[PDB]
Ligand binder design. Structure first.
Ligand SMILES: O=C(O)c1ccccc1Sc1ccccc1S(=O)(=O)N[C@]12C[C@H]3C[C@H](C[C@H](C3)C1)C2
Lengths: 206, 205
């Protein structure tokens, strides 16, 4: 009634996009520790139940392509869809190897009026970068820093993954991300932000 | 450990700001039924434990001031502090009688480096736009929209109050708001947004 329904063949796709290396032209730098964060995330979301795919040094044009192609896929048998972005960022834009794409444009592909197969199911978006059913319902964003600090990993992620490894299967999504906020805030300063359009409670299990 | 602490003399002040009437020179419109919502809200946050106070048709002047005066008060005996805005809106700006004041201005007053006594305590902001602890930690915003549609109440408020009317004292803040995001979407379509920098679970008891 109040859980999001999990009685699905699969938990879902989980697209990690690990941009470490950027063209000189951007002025952005090699992002060190991102590899440690893709691994943490890759493994954590494997354990959860997600069919993880890690993209690497992904270009703005292939960030926009692979998410569109992922939204055109059939999700009829998936409980949700996660997507995880590990790049550089500015107000309302994630970076690629060749430039910047608006984050809203990347997520738009999974809107209800486009990705009918992910209707009524959580669309999760986690971002580590420096900054008659409605369509935008059943979305959720976890940005690393309120409008992002990290070779020994990054704070938001080291923490996100710690918390999923233990309570990931026994705690609601907001209970988790909240605990990730306290962890980042106390020590790991910055504070992570969480936007929820979710209309139900998201447990990754039973 | 993981719940926010409520063992305080008071739950906190709750400033409701009910802009129904907007000046001619300003171009904004009557938001009619905001008084049904403000009252709806007055009772809900009254039952919860809040010292709700309703100011009506404020100036952008009065708002930024009225929130500055509020941040400077003493909360050592308060568990949190609530605030509710019922005006017209556009992007990162709230409206008044004389114009618009950016919302960051209203909230900044309660940042960790300003209001030492509401530190590590929930700062709650509910907003209906019709059309080593960090500084920005422990705020929560509930916008009514990501338009926002409304006499006879408005959808966002109607639901928020219903859900609190019952589950206010036995449900975490995010669970409540998650239900308020469901009712607004299905029963009526638009969707409310919820921003949490909370670092703990917020129960009103
Ligand atoms: O500094 C505080 O006032 C502040 C204090 C505590 C929490 C957040 C903030 S900011 C703020 C305040 C109110 C509502 C939303 C935000 S926000 O988290 O989304 N931050 C921005 C930062 C810039 C100015 C304005 C519009 C846009 C760009 C986003 C607020």
């Amino acid at each position: 009634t109040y859980q999001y329904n999990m009685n699905f063949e699969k938990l879902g796709k989980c697209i990690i996009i690990n941009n470490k290396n950027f063209d000189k032209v951007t002025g952005m730098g090699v992002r060190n520790g991102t590899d440690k964060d893709a691994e943490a995330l890759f493994k954590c979301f494997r354990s959860l139940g997600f069919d993880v795919i890690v993209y690497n040094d992904c270009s703005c044009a292939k960030m926009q392509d692979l998410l569109k192609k992922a939204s055109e896929e059939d999700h009829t048998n998936a409980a949700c869809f996660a997507c995880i972005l590990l790049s550089h960022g500015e107000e309302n834009v994630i970076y690629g190897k060749d430039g910047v794409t608006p984050i809203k444009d990347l997520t738009a592909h999974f809107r209800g009026d486009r990705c009918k197969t992910l209707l009524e199911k959580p669309k999760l978006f986690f971002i580590q970068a420096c900054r008659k059913i409605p369509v935008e319902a059943d979305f959720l964003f976890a940005y690393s820093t309120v409008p992002s600090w990290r070779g020994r990993g990054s704070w938001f992620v080291q923490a996100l993954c710690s918390i999923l490894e233990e309570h990931g299967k026994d705690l609601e999504i907001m209970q988790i991300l909240t605990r990730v906020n306290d962890r980042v805030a106390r020590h790991f300063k910055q504070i992570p932000c969480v936007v929820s359009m979710l209309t139900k409670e998201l447990y990754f299990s039973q």
